[PDB]
Amino acid sequence: ISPIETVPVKLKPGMDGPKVKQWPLTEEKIKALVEICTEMEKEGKISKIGPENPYNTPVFAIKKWRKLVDFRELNKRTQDFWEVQLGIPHPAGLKKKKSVTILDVGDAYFSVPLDEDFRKYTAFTIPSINNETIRYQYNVLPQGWKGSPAIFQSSMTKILEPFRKQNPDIVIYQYMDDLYVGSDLEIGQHRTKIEELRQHLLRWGLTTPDKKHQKEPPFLWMGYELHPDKWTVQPIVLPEKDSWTVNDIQKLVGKLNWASQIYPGIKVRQLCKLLRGTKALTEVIPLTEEAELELAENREILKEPVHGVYYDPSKDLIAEIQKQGQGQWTYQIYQEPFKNLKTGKYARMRGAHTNDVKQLTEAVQKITTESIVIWGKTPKFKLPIQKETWETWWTEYWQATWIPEWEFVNTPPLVKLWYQLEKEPIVGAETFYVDGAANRETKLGKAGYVTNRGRQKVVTLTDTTNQKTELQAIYLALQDSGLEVNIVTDSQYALGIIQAQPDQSESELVNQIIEQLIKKEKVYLAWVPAHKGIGGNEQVDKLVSA
Amino acid sequence: ETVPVKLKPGMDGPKVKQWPLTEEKIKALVEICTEMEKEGKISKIGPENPYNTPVFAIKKKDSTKWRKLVDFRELNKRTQDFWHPAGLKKKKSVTILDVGDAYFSVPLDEDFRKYTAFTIPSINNETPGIRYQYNVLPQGWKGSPAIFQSSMTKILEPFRKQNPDIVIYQYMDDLYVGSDLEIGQHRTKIEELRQHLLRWGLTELHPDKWTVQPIVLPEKDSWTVNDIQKLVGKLNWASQIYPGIKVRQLCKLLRGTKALTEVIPLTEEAELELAENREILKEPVHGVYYDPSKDLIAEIQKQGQGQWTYQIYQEPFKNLKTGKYARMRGTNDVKQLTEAVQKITTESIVIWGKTPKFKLPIQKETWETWWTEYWQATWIPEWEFVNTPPLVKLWYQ
Ligand SMILES: Cc1ccnc2c1NC(=O)c1cccnc1N2C1CC1
């Protein structure tokens, strides 16, 4: 097998892995394991033990027979290791090669030596009808043990180390028991380098498929088709049935959701509807007409092929964004007009209170971080907003906010400020002194207002709070008012929410206010402390407390 | 020799994840690390070391070459404990020096190394990270300055006997030296210290200017209802810090549901009320004393146009110091915010010799994507993200 320095392993402090008894098996298995084992025994993989070993994992036999072992126990008492990178390479950030070979080592774990010191801990056993006596223990990484992945990769990394320093024009990707190798050499040169690689590994005991057994490009990657110079979006097929269980529907959505990034115009609103109130996965829901519709429109869309290019470090990275509805954004990142590297969609973030500018800001933050990972760079942005609006928003917003280098792109619908609060009171404009209160034991509340022109109104609410009532008042004011208003409230809460000029929310109330707000021609909102002899306020303070 | 260091009882090594880095940065690391590797400062580690600490690259002040920076916050907080001249704060000028270099000379107890593990990432995870662990005293570790104190003092006595008028205070990787001297003699003499320091292996603030700034009230020719309301608001708040502040007379001017723009003539009583309040404010509220058994807190609000107000305190409304920060030439709330925190931390270091916990008016996502891009200190304080009340801001204006 392999001759690399084994890794020092130790059981979590204190813990030790003693015993999960053996599962007496039939006679057909007790011997179908006795066989496979004698094998490994010679290859040097497993070593007939017993001399001094109290530990033990249970062996199983599954339909070919083949053996499985439960370190489930062993593992949880095994120290933690340096995680296997689960952060993985995305097609959009790869550099076009002329060729890319893949070498499936396959039989690997069983090639790497186990930390002798620790092998004892691997002991397991084989049944025997009449239990009249088979004890073994691994000498190499066990298929199923906690540290096999980390310990293996690491060895792998160490074995290539030379090779790479020697062959910088070559690029290797290590994934699981796989190795993706590409280059810029010529068809024969590369072939030859692979061969070199192949034997180099065997010089270390790691077996790999030859040239007439290795798999061929394109290669499937987390959804894509990878050709060494380009990639294609795997065609996406949607089944056509007369029986659509909830399950069938969810998974469809799940599929469509994925396509929403690559493909333009996908919809799931009406398919999603069909799950409303579903009582079981196995339940059957007849697709509505609109459902049977978008689904079809989606099939048409899904036939289209999505071709894509790789990264060229000698060209600008550029990210352009679109507002595909409230809270919904689309983005495409390319280097050459229309030759996209990557595309995606960010779904409606439905929170307490924001606005497009804010929303846009987060979309941008998201693409940046994606980019810093994919390409280790920040794209030059092209946003559907005017430097003037961004200048207005930031210059006046209470929170640190930033947008890396960017450029306006006049591609409506544009992101704007649906309304702005006056900075000073409005002259001649009516003046509403509003207020609301609620009890802390009945949740009974009163909301209303009193104004200069005598006008007024109070109203009772049930099952509300201080903040819901206070908002209520502001709404009333916005209704029984002209196109220009001055509103004075005592609610720091109401204020702040509004002081931040929201244009989207999940509160029916707030939403309404917003609307009202966008409608008016001039609005100035003001704040005055709660219970004082402050004109107008002391007045409403009397009506919302009777 | 190696003084054995240990983690706080029952605590385990840091397992903090590595945020992604710019190409540029990563390279510089790969560069820097191969160097420290060759020199023995650090060694490559295996899969069995599960610990990990964040690292990045910076460019302190006017530098083309990058500086490796490791964020040992979690490690520090998990490291056992080890063991401030008020004179420092009470000086004309104070200069900061970077003695991090000194630590390389000292080896780290081999049993503690594992914890110091870190990683140089790769773009698109295209590659397995470059894992390292220190073999010496790392810069940024609360433990380094400590185990080095002994040798530090030594190398210092000389300058502390020659010039027993100046004060030398060390915080982490920084050395703070203060003298009531004049600049010409100051810039030249500091040089003298870096000279003495150089023959070993190493290489402009005014404290008498930091205080609790005064609240100022608006003064205007004429007053509208609005004007008066906003005034009472501010005053009302301010009453929490100065219970001497009264608003009766002003409240009266308002009695009635009048127009907001209506102009109101002031009463002799109201004008007194203001006069009296203005005076209650001409100074910081009595009895505000710093407590070492407690945590310093630094709160910052965004005033707009590049202005930022902040208050350092341990107990609410009892400010030890309050301030403002204008903007550094060269439209980036994050550079400004980062710059501000560094200013306020240094300032906090000088006075009380400890960093304040920051409450930042910004979104976690935003700050984490970029702060490291304008950071320039060897240290990193603690911070949390908040939502500035609409009021708190109008008040400190
Ligand atoms: C799956 C995968 C992950 C990371 N990189 C690669 C691959 N596989 C390829 O087929 C590939 C295609 C184009 C460019 N690099 C590629 N390779 C690099 C090795 C040449």
* B191 Cα to chain A: minimum distance (Å): 39
Residue A515 burial (CB count, 10 A): 14
What H or E segment, with its residue span, contains residue B308? strand B307-315
Non-local (6+) Cβ contacts of A299 within 8 A are A238
**DSSP class of A133:** -
What are the C-alpha distances in Å from A448 to residues A203, A416, B235, B255? 86, 32, 27, 19
CA B74 to chain centre: 17
Output the CA torsion A10→A11→A12→A18 (10° steps).
-170
Do the chains contact at A400 and B366, CB–CB below 8 Å? yes
Pairing of strands A57-62, A124-125: parallel
Could you give the maximum distance between any two Cα atoms of chain B, in Å? 81
For B279, other C-beta atoms within 10 Å of its C-beta total: 10
The coordinates were experimentally obtained by: X-ray
CA dihedral A30, A34, A40, A43 (to 10 degrees): 180
Tell me the three state secondary structure of residue A368: helix
Are B362 and A399 an interchain contact pair (Cβ–Cβ within 8 Å)? yes
Measure CB to CB from residue B20 to each of A90, A372, A399 and give the nearest one.
Answer: A372
Q: What is the C-alpha to C-alpha distance for residues A362 and A348, in angstroms, rounded to an integer?
A: 12
Question: Position B211: which residue type?
Answer: T
User: What is the rounded distance in angstroms from the CA atom of residue A292 to the CA atom of residue A299?
Assistant: 11
- How far is Cα A170 from Cα A150, in angstroms, rounded to an integer? 24
Residue with tokens 């946003």: A383
Q: Taking CB atoms and an 8 Å cutoff, what residues of chain A touch B26?
A: 376
Taking the CA of residue A155 and the nearest CA in chain B, the distance in Å comes to 9
What residue segments make up the domains of chain A, in order of their start? 1-84+110-148, 85-109+149-217, 218-311, 312-418, 419-533
CA–CA separation, A64 and A32 (whole Å): 10
How far is A451 from chain B, CA to nearest CA, in Å?
6
Does the domain at residues B291-395 carry the CATH identifier 3.30.70.270? yes
Angle at A86 between CA A80 and CA A88, to 5 degrees: 155
Fold of A218-311: Alpha-Beta Plaits (3.30.70)
Indicate the CATH number of A419-533 among 3.40.50.720, 3.30.420.10, 3.30.70.1450, 3.40.47.10: 3.30.420.10
Name the DSSP letter for residue A51. Answer: T
CA distance B26 to chain A (A): 9
Q: Is the dihedral of CA B383, B384, B386, B389 positive or negative?
A: negative
Known binder of ligand: residue B173? yes
For residue A291 the two structure tokens come to 């459902």
- Dist. CA B190–CA B332, nearest whole Å: 34
B233 touches A: beta carbon within 8 Å: yes
C-alpha triplet A35, A62, A2: angle, nearest 5°: 55
Q: What CATH number was assigned to the domain covering residues A312-418?
A: 3.30.70.270
B195 touches chain A (CB under 8 A): no
Closest CA to A81 of B47, B133, B11, B113: B47
Task: Say if residues A509 and A471 touch (Cβ distance below 8 Å).
Answer: yes
Superfamily (CATH) of domain B1-85+104-144? HIV Type 1 Reverse Transcriptase, subunit A, domain 1 (3.10.10.10)
Q: Does the annotation list B174 as a binding residue?
A: yes
Q: Chain B 302-321, CB below 8 Å of chain A: which residues?
A: 302, 304-305
Q: Which of B26, B260, B302, B339 to mutate to test the interface with A (most CBs of A within 10 A)?
A: B260
Ligand 1: nearest atom to the Cα of A183 = 20
Annotated binding residues of A for Mg(2+), as ranges?
Answer: 104, 177-178, 435, 470, 490, 541
> Which of A 372-411 lie inside 8 A of B, CB atoms?
372-378, 394-402
Resolution to 1 decimal, in Å? Answer: 2.8
A415: left (phi over 0), alpha (psi -120 to 50) or beta: beta
Q: How far, in Å, CA of A28 to CA of A129, rounded?
A: 10
Q: Which residues pair with A182 in a beta bridge?
A: A100, A171
A228 lines ligand 1 (CB under 6 A): yes
Nearest CA distance, A7 vs chain B (angstrom): 7
Residue closest by Cα to atom 5 of ligand 1? A173
CB of residue A221 inside a 6 A radius of ligand 1: yes
Best residue of A156, A373, A398 to probe chain B, by most B CBs closer than 10 Å: A398
CB B50 within 8 A of CB B15: yes
Q: Which of A82, A145, A543 should we substitute to test contact with B (largest number of B Cβ atoms within 10 Å)?
A: A82
B1-85+104-144 and B291-395 have identical folds: no
Name the fold adopted by A85-109+149-217.
Alpha-Beta Plaits (3.30.70)
> Per-residue DSSP letters for A417-467?
-S----SS--SSSEEEEEEEEE-TTT--EEEEEEETTS-EEEEEESS--HH
A528: chain B residues, CB-CB within 8 Å? 229, 232-233
The size of the A-B interface in CB pairs under 8 A is: 190
Q: Taking the CA atoms of A211, A217, A220 and A221 in sequence, report the sign of the dihedral they define.
A: positive
Provide the CATH number for the domain formed by B87-103+145-203 in this structure: 3.30.70.270
Question: Rounded to whole angstroms, how far apart are CA atoms A16 and A13?
Answer: 8
Cα–Cα distance, A436 to A237 (Å, whole number) = 57
Nearest to B69 by CA among B107, B125, B28, B106: B28
Spatial separation of the C-alpha atoms in residues A516 and A510, rounded to whole Å: 10
Backbone angles phi, psi at A176, to 5 degrees: 50, -130
Q: Which fold has domain B204-290?
A: Alpha-Beta Plaits (3.30.70)
Residue A533 to residue B131, Cβ atoms within 8 A: no
- Tell me if A242 sits within 8 A of A317, measured CB to CB: no
**Rg of the Cα trace of chain A?**
34
Nearest protein Cα to ligand 1, atom 7: A180
Q: What CA–CA distance (Å, rounded) separates A522 from A417?
A: 14
Q: Report the 3 state secondary structure along A243-273.
A: CCEHHHHHHHHHHHHHHHHHCCCCCCHHHHH
Please indicate whether, in this complex, the C-beta atoms of A82 and B48 are within 8 angstroms of each other.
yes
- Indicate which of B22, B45, B48 best probes the interface with A, i.e. most A CBs within 10 Å of its own CB: B48
Nearest CA, atom 18, ligand 1: A182
Q: What end-to-end distance do the CA atoms of chain A give, in Å?
A: 89
- The yes/no answer on whether domain A1-84+110-148 falls in CATH 3.20.20.105 is no
* Spans of all domains in chain B: 1-85+104-144, 87-103+145-203, 204-290, 291-395
Question: Comparing A218-311 with A419-533, is the CATH topology the same?
Answer: no
CA–CA separation, A489 and B284 (whole Å): 31
CA separation for the pair B29, B122 (Å, rounded): 11
Q: Following CA atoms A310, A311, A315, A317 in sequence, which dihedral angle do they give, to the nearest 10 degrees? A: 100
Contacts of B168 (CB under 8 A, 6+ apart): B156, B159, B160, B175, B176, B177
- What's the CA-to-centroid distance between A313 and ligand 1, angstroms? 16
Distance to chain B for A51, nearest Cα, Å: 28
CA–CA separation, A84 vs A91, rounded Å? 20
Query: Could you tell me if the CB of A219 is within 6 A of ligand 1?
Result: yes
Residues of B in contact with A361 (CB under 8 A): 366
Q: Which residues of B touch A153 (CB under 8 A)?
A: 47, 128
Q: Can the peptide bond before residue A218 be classed as cis, meaning omega within 30 degrees of 0?
A: yes
Residue B226's closest CA among A424, A453, A500? Answer: A424
Could you tell me if B232 and B251 are in contact, meaning their C-beta atoms sit under 8 angstroms apart? yes
SS3 B367: helix
Q: Does the distance separating the beta carbons of B123 and A93 come in below 8 Å? A: yes
Residue B64 contacts by C-beta under 8 Å, 6 or more apart in sequence? Answer: none
Gap between the Cα atoms of A101 and A216, Å rounded: 7
A244 lines ligand 1 (CB under 6 A): no
